[PDB]
A paper describes a structure:
S-layer proteins (SLPs) are self-assembling, crystalline proteins coating the cell surfaces of many prokaryotes. We determined the atomic resolution structures of all functional domains (I-III from N- to C-termini) present in the three S-layer proteins SlpA_ac, SlpX_ac, and SlpA_amy. The Lactobacillus S-layers are anchored to the cell wall through interaction with teichoic acids (TA), either lipoteichoic acid (LTA) or wall teichoic acid (WTA).
The full-length SlpX_ac shows differences in structure and domain arrangement compared to the SlpA architecture. SlpX_ac_III is structurally highly conserved compared to SlpA_ac_III and SlpA_amy_III, whereas the sequence is less conserved (37 to 41% identity, 52 to 56% similarity). The crystal structures of the TAB domains (SlpA_ac_III, SlpA_amy_III, and SlpX_ac_III) reveal high structural similarities. The general structure of the TAB domain consists of two cell wall binding motifs (SlpA_motif) which are connected by a short linker and arranged as an internal homodimer. Mapping of the surface charges indicates a large, highly positively charged region within the interface of the two motifs that extends to the C-terminal part of the protein. The TAB domain (SlpX_ac_III) would still face inward and anchor the S-layer to the cell wall analogously to the SlpA-only layer.
Numbering used by the authors: 370 to 505
Write the structure that this text describes.
Amino acid sequence: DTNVKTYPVMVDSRAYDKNGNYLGHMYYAYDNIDIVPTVVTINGKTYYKVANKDEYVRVTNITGNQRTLKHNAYIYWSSYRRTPGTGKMYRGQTVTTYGPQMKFKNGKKYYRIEGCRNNNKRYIKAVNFYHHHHHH
Ligand SMILES: [Ca+2]
Ligand SMILES: [Zn+2]
Ligand SMILES: [Zn+2]
Ligand SMILES: [Zn+2]
């Protein structure tokens, strides 16, 4: 494989055959992974092929998703704690999120965002990417 990019795994990625069957192992955040940077669709979902393996990992977990804030957002380490020293992001700013929504112990859903590491945890509440806040 001659076309290869390196990216941190931002979310523990299940490894899948070309048919979208789980192979029983994972790639782990925040290790680097080598991928062929060509999007591959399998049963409606996007993957990258791991370099020199007939293995596929979800794009969302690697290069993630461009999302636009619909509301001012604080950056959270956990349910009740802001990432230390962080400010806010504003309605209209663009954020890279990785992976599906994650349910914290408060019961609310979060997106892991660019820069999140074990010593620098960075999440935004999912609702801040939706128009309707009928919950305030
Ligand atoms: Ca807010
Ligand atoms: Zn609002
Ligand atoms: Zn409001
Ligand atoms: Zn609101």
